[PDB]
Amino acid sequence: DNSRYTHFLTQHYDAKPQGRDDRYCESIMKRRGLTSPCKDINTFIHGNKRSIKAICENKNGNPHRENLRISKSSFQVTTCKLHGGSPWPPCQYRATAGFRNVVVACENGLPVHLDQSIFR
Template identity: 70%
Template sequence: MVMVLSPLFLVFMLGLDLLPLALAQDDYRYRHFLTQHYDAKPKGRDDKYCDYIMQNRGLTSPCKDTNTFIHGKKNDIKAICEDRNGEPYGGNLRISKSAFQVTTCKHRGGSSRPPCRYRATKAYRVIVIGCENGLPVHFDESFIPPSQ
């Protein structure tokens, strides 16, 4: 018995082959976002914290000028990509409905080569992130929420 495969079936099978690649790319971008901008339970949140975490996360070759770390639960950050905790903010950006505890590390200046020294600023801020396929992949900005 000879089986004839329809073109639609072939397209479906090709799509199944490419799906893991697309999911792996999303997963990589999300993991990269977490490496650069997420620290669940920070210790200290002072200048030494920034010096340590910036080096530990590979953000000091050359010294990155400014980087913000979001503290809390991953699911709360993911929820910004949905209506549960986020609203559209233009393009694929979303703004959080709630404030997050953040630490912003700003390079103190001087050489852009290690050793890098940072000044820490800690605050509660509304954050703006870029989302793709329901996952945060880009930190855009943060600001102090307006008084209600």
């Protein structure tokens, strides 16, 4: 049962991002159901899925800290950071594009958790 990998995709995967600017964040955040209440910080990995799953193997990952894996490759990435004083919509986001390796947790060879700390 990998509903958790599906949920990872929903929360942290966007194949081919449009603009990656503020309005991209404000939109994909709403579209992926992360706006009730406003998620304070959330990061989307772009590119193909093969690469993300491969972090679970030695192919594209190393063990990291206690329970996690850190990728060998660098991914294109957009971090959406909630702006303003309310946890409730409308949620205004600032976008930060980046390019670097990511940290996930894996169950049964699939990413089920993104560690958001490296993007804060």
